[PDB]
Nucleic acid binder design. Structure first.
Length: 95
RNA sequence: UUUU
């Protein structure tokens, strides 16, 4: 009972900014590991993003990660997966 | 092994 909605708002903002960095053009131009994990439509499992060190440092609460991304104009969520909103299909690469 |  030490968990409170108000005391996760800043954490959500740090998570949102971190994940928006992964899906930035600047990062995607060099992030071959991430692109090699994408499906042909650009989607990645949100749980894969949650495992990355800078996200995992901030939280292991998957609801907070989902909430942080509903707040984003950079990414699109469908069910368990997330992709860049703009031209996602340009980025996938063979595994 | 990773600002994957």
């Amino acid at each position: 009972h030490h968990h409170h909605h108000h005391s996760q708002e800043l954490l959500k903002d740090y998570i949102k900014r971190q994940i928006e960095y992964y899906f930035s053009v600047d990062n995607l131009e060099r992030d071959f590991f991430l692109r090699r994990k994408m499906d042909a439509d650009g989607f990645l499992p949100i749980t894969l993003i949650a495992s990355f060190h800078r996200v995992q440092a901030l939280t292991t609460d998957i609801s907070l990660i989902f909430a942080a991304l509903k707040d984003s104009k950079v990414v699109e969520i469908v069910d368990e997966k997330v992709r860049r909103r703009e031209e996602p299909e340009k980025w996938p690469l063979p595994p």
